[PDB]
Design a protein around this ligand. Sequence first.
Ligand SMILES: O=C(O)CCC(=O)C(=O)O
Ligand SMILES: [Fe+3]
Length: 251
Amino acid sequence: QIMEPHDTLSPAQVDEYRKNGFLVQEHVFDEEEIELLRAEAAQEFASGGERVTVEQGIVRGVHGCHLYSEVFGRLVRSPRLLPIARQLLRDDVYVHQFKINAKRAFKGEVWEWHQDYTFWHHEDGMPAPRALSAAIFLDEVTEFNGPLTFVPGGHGSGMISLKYSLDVETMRGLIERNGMVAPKGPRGSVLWFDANIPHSSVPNISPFDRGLVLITYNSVENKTDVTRGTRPEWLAARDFTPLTALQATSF
Ligand SMILES: O=C(O)CCC(=O)C(=O)O
Ligand SMILES: [Fe+3]
């Protein structure tokens, strides 16, 4: 049995990622693959216990699934994902954080402007922004179902109800200078984005869900300082073993 040889990003794609701080690959996973992930996400929402976040009734998100789900444990090692994480971070990598964020049809909340790295640095002791997130689109992402919205190039400045949100004046500057972009894509796409890129999102006013599986890969060299960590393993990983790619086996 055979896995397709590892695909990596072209130089132009890498350049775009580094310039903009995000990049979309369309149609990485097929419909049947996404349905397997959707079904597993539903199980995690149902069984996640303390790892679930709710609509202040409906479970809206869950954390740390790769530690508890064999499917999600395999996903983070996928030959569709791991080679690109290694390429972009120029290192062996591990998963710092894993979350699934559902924005159901005609529902969802405003995510205030933030940089993920600010949290990871201060809360988890991540020493540098040598990390990224891969957002797998469980559903088509459109203008109208609450897409992640970015300041392109806004990661280049460095580190600027969320604990760490960005104020009106600091954001005004960024946006006046750099603008705003909400990357779109079909179901099965992957949105790669930098640990330090400012992003936000709005409620879903479509009749369609916007499920995202967000895998945060960190450089092994850039492992967090667990002496200054404040969070459980399912929010901030402590096992820095380098990930290896899934091979094709008979089971
Ligand atoms: O799901 C979203 O719209 C925002 C997710 C996010 O930025 C985050 O969890 O840090
Ligand atoms: Fe975020």
